[PDB]
């Protein structure tokens, strides 16, 4: 039904945005074995921005990861240094949320729901590129933390919500043809 | 020490590719299916649903079914890049498996050759599990329909 | 005597996979075909996969050959998808292990107490024997069907 | 010491020389054009247009779909040789990649074991191409839709 | 002696399999096509050209327009599919063996595949395109003459 | 040709059940070369008892010692208790029971579907059992006629399942007329 | 046209039979580097039955191949005898007989089908024979002209089989119109 | 639309012809470290003249000597005489003539067809030329703008052939209707 579909789209959009925002701000992406603070190797957090230390003589200390301690490698290093792709995923999810909010008001436009669908799909694609860039940048034991999987779950939910938005727009234009 | 013959893992058929490659293959599959669904069925000026998009993408990855292919420029772009991706990834899987077996065969210590059922048993487990799941789903749908008749 | 290289046996094209893998492949083929037939056509609410067409589908999926028909149901698609995955793994693994065999010859002494060569016809003769045997069998079956249907025309 | 390198993006093209890729593209265009010509040029038989010929050729090479197969003698000649070509080239790609991954040969830039699983770093480029293609597809679809919407107003 | 790098043959793409395997492949292809045609059309109760096409596409692991529907046709198709799978796998495996062994050869003290290695397949391809164009034009001239003058 | 179909399915069900039960109970699954009850001599090992022959004290034989990374423990457990061969036997029994009850309380033509489902599931269980058996054997040899009795049970069970489903389809076809 | 098809089938049948008989008879199957007669090395014909010396101390001496000095034994049995090439010749002869009897004792319309089946079977027998020959030999050299006579026989036999089946189809077509 | 198409095909024909003629004429096909007119220095080699650059006597050009198995001799011949690039140029010229003659004699449509066949054939000749060139070179370096002019000529020739065939189909649809 239309009401249930719209509610489920809105809830999914909010969930995806919240998950991606948490992931891009929290620090538990990679349980590697690095250095807490330098200039003895122990376990670490190593998020997207700050590599907090754990299980060492001093815990909880965080330093900004040393991005830039080969132009092909330089561009990847730059793209990982910022999180243009994770951040862009967050922005696109936010803009999709704005579109869905404008759906209820100022309605009968029928092209803002399409916009929401396009934004959610694009957010998913941005997220996947971000994940690949991140995993590639760390190839130079380990494990992935819950913030990484929050990013992944965000991707899946964003794709589902995009499907819902596109399907919902198709109905409007079917109704608007009957 | 005794050579200590290795016991293969059940899901050892995934060894040729890193865990992150499998993960990203699944994400790419979802993305491709969704985008194919969107570009194919989204413009009033045309009316591959989501389920058919998913099926199309799977049988491209498995180098299998060819039931229906996109006819539009956008659908064809999506299909073509997914076919490229699939070709590279499957070729790479086979090549790295061959590397694994060839290298493991030329080890000479300080002084059977065929592939055993243990090396692939996990794929059989998945197969039979999938057959069971399929039967369950079919029976669930049949029970639903049989209970949905007006009484 | 030094363990010289063995002459390739007829039916050496099966050597990459253990006998148990072949046997279980055949069992899996029968099971998949039967489950596809069951799921495809058992509910009266569905009323092209009969048992013979299910078997054909499964065979051609294994030999990565044609399709001709694809399940359209959820459950038939589950069955097809797992069979496709199985096929991909098993065929890839056959090719990989055969490459391993041909790359490195590994001789072993029967008792204990290099500029690689083109495959010869001896290395795949068995598959030719099977092919021509199958062609003969096909002709025989066709002629039996024709003779039978001809007698049915008499009466 | 040579110290085996970190694999580059677009290293999935390494099994075949740059010239093979270039000539594959040329052969693809040639095949598509000749299939189109030899199928839609006789007025004495007026599906294989220019975009359906290109699609046929693409899918034949990627060992993928078959919407249509040429039914004429000439289209079948073209299809058969393109199929042969495809089989050889793809087999050769897989075989040479296996050779690369089996034996590592580090090269000294100046002169005067355990076979790890394959990492996301040496297939990354194919993922980038895939997502770029998805973005391009979405763009093309939206352009077509905007164009059709504006034209329908009149 | 100097290394004397060996020029690959124009048709070196046939090297993984012996000459007799290629010969017998061609014989097998003709036999399969003919038997498929007989067991499919002989009963008063897949013509030759369509049966040849089916067999060709089966061998190149490629096309799939039509497939036999009868028991006999399906037996023929099944054995041909098995044969194809074994032969193509064996070709790829032996090519990999060739390239791997040639790659581990150390002399006394790129690695990509060059256009010279696959030149013959390009020659065949363009020859086939020329032949196709010629056949098309011959048919068209014949059809133009065929109309009652 | 209904009527003969019922006899053929009943015979097949009984044959499959008998074959699988004999296979489980009998112990000629594997002609290995190991130690009898506690020199290496041949043995007709089975699902339960690794049993001796051509030895000093042939015919005296014992219970296989299944046990000496949770995966190894779980596989050893699943193979110790022949849960999958036994489940195959149970499912074949239930399938046969449904086919027998297809005479009583007739006109349901919905339990014979259950018969088909039971036979198919018995076959799947059987194949999983074979795979676990062979896998656990890897923790010269040959396979005995008990192994092949299990395999033949699988094949016949699948055929009988196909017949049962076909009969259910035919029954609903008649009903829809 | 229909009139020429009989001529093409018959002449092709005769050509195939003659080529296969010549191939089975003549000695130029394999230009090997062999022994002219035992108890050094020179080029040799090595036909199907007799290997015959050439370019040697006494050029022209021809001897019987010593085929012999369990799968290998059976292959030796099938190769030393030429059951498959000989069977090809027999089947081509019977196909020719069927074509000849097409006119005399006419209107049977299954004699033409028998001709087609015989020619196709002769082709298949020929291929099996070629594979057995080549397999037996290995484990330089070249293939003589009798070998390629056998190969050309195979091709022509298959073409003639196709023609025969086509003629049978055309009869049973007219018949129904 | 129509009317534009003739101009576009004419322009494309001229562009392809000019590019291919320049490419065959000029000498920046290959940047390699060879020897100038007869140390090492960068040498833009062409189809005919290998010539010296960034040296003491840059701008000195020498005729390439294409000679010191039969395949090697024939490849050396086919590459020495750039028969395939030249044939590409000739076919492009003939295609241009056919397009030009289209405006006259317009009642006959087989001259706009011939134009398409010539352009497509020019593309095929170009491909064979590139393959022989690269192969002969193979029995550090880079490709110069002449090589890519040949490549672009191939692309445009194929596009123009497509357009020519397309307009032949229209012309024959108007007369069908
Ligand atoms: C037909 C239609 C579909 C066709 C495809 C459509 C389009 C293809 C899209 C192009 C992607 C490839 C370029 C990215 C890249 O290589 O840059 C860098 C990483 O790259 C990144 O980190 C960028 C990741 C984003 C890629 C595109 C996302 C678009 C949405 C790598 O640097 P480089 O200098 O590029 O590397 C040179 C090569 N080398 C590594 C061997 C030395
Ligand atoms: C949508 C499409 C439907 C697809 C349906 C997919 C269904 C997936 C089902 C898979 C079953 C997994 C079995 C299992 O865990 O195996 C165990 C073996 O122990 C046994 O012997 C397994 C028992 C038989 C399994 C019967 C089904 C071991 O597994 P693990 O411990 O998890 O493996 C980790 C460690 N290891 C690799 C070293 C082993
Ligand atoms: C769907 C229909 C499918 C078609 C169905 C079945 C088709 C099977 C056809 C027959 C198979 C050949 C039998 C065979 O290989 O025997 C011998 C060779 O064989 C020969 O040398 C005989 C030559 C003619 C055989 C072909 C008949 C047509 C080999 O000896 P063996 O005793 O078989 O032992 C195997 C060899 N090994 C022990 C060294 C490994
Ligand atoms: C039904 C479908 C259509 C099927 C088939 C279609 C027909 C295919 C015809 C193509 C034949 C090409 C050819 O034979 O080149 C020869 C010359 O090789 C060279 O010296 C290189 C020069 C190449 C120029 C040839 C262009 C062909 C284009 C055509 C326009 C190869 O050398 P060779 O002397 O023939 O043989 C020995 C070579 N070897 C020892 C190196 C292995
Ligand atoms: C619409 C389509 C219908 C559905 C089509 C379904 C077919 C595809 C299934 C593929 C295999 C899936 C299972 C993959 C195996 C997972 C095993 C695994 O993850 O192993 C863990 C390992 O121990 C390390 O963690
Ligand atoms: C429904 C339509 C029917 C289509 C049917 C198509 C057939 C496809 C399979 C053919 C290969 C089967 C033959 C495999 C023979 C194996 C040889 C063997 O048994 O090995 C010998 C021995 O065990 C070791 O020495
Ligand atoms: C008819 C409509 C079909 C639509 C088309 C579908 C897509 C075609 C498939 C694959 C594209 C592959 C693109 C390959 C990109 C190569 C990138 C590359 O070459 O970069 C490496 C660099 O040169 C090293 O230094
Ligand atoms: C019914 C439709 C028919 C479609 C028809 C198109 C199919 C063409 C396929 C493959 C051609 C391969 C040609 C093989 C040529 C290789 C010959 C060769 O070179 O052999 C001599 C060798 O070089 C000495 O060393
Ligand atoms: C086509 C759909 C296929 C989906 C398959 C889902 C399988 C999920 C298994 C996840 C295992 C994750 C292992 C964690 C490893 C780690 O990071 O330590
Ligand atoms: C869509 C194609 C099917 C493939 C889906 C497979 C998903 C596998 C998920 C990851 C598990 C394998 C990783 C191994 C972990 C390890 O090294 O211990
Ligand atoms: C998809 C179903 C059929 C596919 C073809 C499978 C071939 C079956 C072969 C079974 C017996 C193999 C015996 C090999 C072991 C040995 O040589 O001792
Ligand atoms: C069917 C035709 C298309 C098939 C896909 C081919 C795409 C690859 C082309 C890349 C061009 C060559 C550049 C890579 C070589 C290098 O720089 O080392
Ligand atoms: C169904 C057709 C399959 C493809 C056929 C490929 C062409 C093979 C023709 C025989 C070539 C012989 C090559 C070996 C040459 C030699 O070493 O003397
Ligand atoms: C259908 C796919 C199209 C292919 C797209 C090709 C884009 C990459 C081209 C890179 C060219 C690099 C130039 C090499 C320089 C040289 O050595 O001459």
Author numbering:
A (entry chain F): 5 to 43, 55 to 84, 92 to 162, 173 to 210
B (entry chain A): 505 to 551, 571 to 634, 784 to 823
C (entry chain D): 505 to 551, 570 to 635, 782 to 823
D (entry chain B): 506 to 551, 570 to 635, 782 to 823
E (entry chain C): 505 to 549, 571 to 634, 784 to 823
F (entry chain E), H (entry chain G): 5 to 42, 55 to 84, 92 to 162, 173 to 210
G (entry chain H): 5 to 43, 55 to 84, 93 to 162, 173 to 210
Which sentences did the original study use to describe this structure?
AMPA glutamate receptors (AMPARs), the primary mediators of excitatory neurotransmission in the brain, are either GluA2 subunit-containing and thus Ca2+-impermeable, or GluA2-lacking and Ca2+-permeable. AMPA glutamate receptors (AMPARs) mediate rapid signalling throughout the brain, and orchestrate various forms of synaptic plasticity that underlie learning. These cation channels assemble in various combinations from four core subunits, GluA1–4, with each contributing unique gating kinetics, trafficking and subsynaptic localization. AMPARs exhibit a modular architecture with a two-layer extracellular region connected to the transmembrane ion channel (transmembrane domain, TMD). The ion channel is encircled by diverse auxiliary subunits, modulating receptor gating kinetics, pharmacology and ion flux, with the transmembrane AMPAR regulatory proteins (TARPs γ2, γ3, γ4, γ5, γ7, γ8) being the most abundant.
A GluA2 mutant (F231A) increasing NTD dynamics phenocopies this behaviour, and exhibits reduced synaptic responses, reflecting the anchoring function of the AMPAR NTD at the synapse. The Phe231 to alanine mutation, which destabilizes this interface, slowed desensitization recovery of GluA2(F231A), both in the absence and presence of TARPs (γ2 and γ3). To probe the relationship between NTD stability and gating further, we determined a cryo-EM structure of resting-state GluA2(F231A) fused to TARP γ2 (GluA2(F231A)/γ2; edited at the R/G site), a receptor combination permitting comparison with existing GluA2/γ2 structures.
